[PDB]
Amino acid sequence: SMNPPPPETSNPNKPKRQTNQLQYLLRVVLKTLWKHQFAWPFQQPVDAVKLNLPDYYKIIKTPMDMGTIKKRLENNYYWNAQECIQDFNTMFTNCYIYNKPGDDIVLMAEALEKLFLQKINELPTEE
C-alpha cells in the first residue's frame, strides 16, 4: 500500500492574488481551527499506510487537510476565498463520507466545521 503525493501547494502556471478575504482565511480562520483541541488529525494528509486504511484513497479521490491549506494560504496559491473555502469543505466532507456518523473522527471534524462556519459567517466583504 502507498500514499499518494500530497495535494499541490505551488504551481507557477496557476494565477493567484492576495485578497482581504484570503488574508482573513489565514489570520482568522486557519489560525483559529489549528489551535482547536481536535485539530491534530487534520494538520497533515491522512497517512493511510500508517493507519492501515488501504481503501482510503479508493474512496477519497480528493484528499485535503489543513497542513495543505496552510501551505496554500502562506504561499498565496489561491485566486479567491471560494477556492480556499472549498478545500476546507472537501476536508470535512471526506471525513463524513469515509466514516460512519457518530465516529470519533467525525465528531472531531464536526467540531472544527462548527468553528469554521462561525468564522465564515463573519467573512469580510471584498476590499
Ligand X SMILES: O=c1cc(N2CCOCC2)oc2c(-c3ccccc3)cccc12
Nearer to ligand X, 53 or 115 (CB): 53
**Least spacing, CB of residue 95 vs ligand X, in Å:** 4
**Contact set with ligand X (CB under 6 A):** 41-42, 46, 51, 53, 95, 98-99, 105
**Least spacing, CB of residue 53 vs ligand X, in Å:** 6
Nearer to ligand X, 6 or 41 (CB): 41
Q: Which amino acid is at 112?
A: L
Name the nearest CA neighbour of 67 among 9, 5, 4. Answer: 9
Name the nearest CA neighbour of 29 among 91, 121, 107. Answer: 121
How many other CB atoms are found less than 10 A from the CB of residue 105? 16
Nearer to ligand X, 27 or 114 (CB): 114
**Least spacing, CB of residue 119 vs ligand X, in Å:** 20
Characterise 76 by phi-psi region: left (phi > 0), alpha (psi -120 to 50), beta (else).
Answer: left
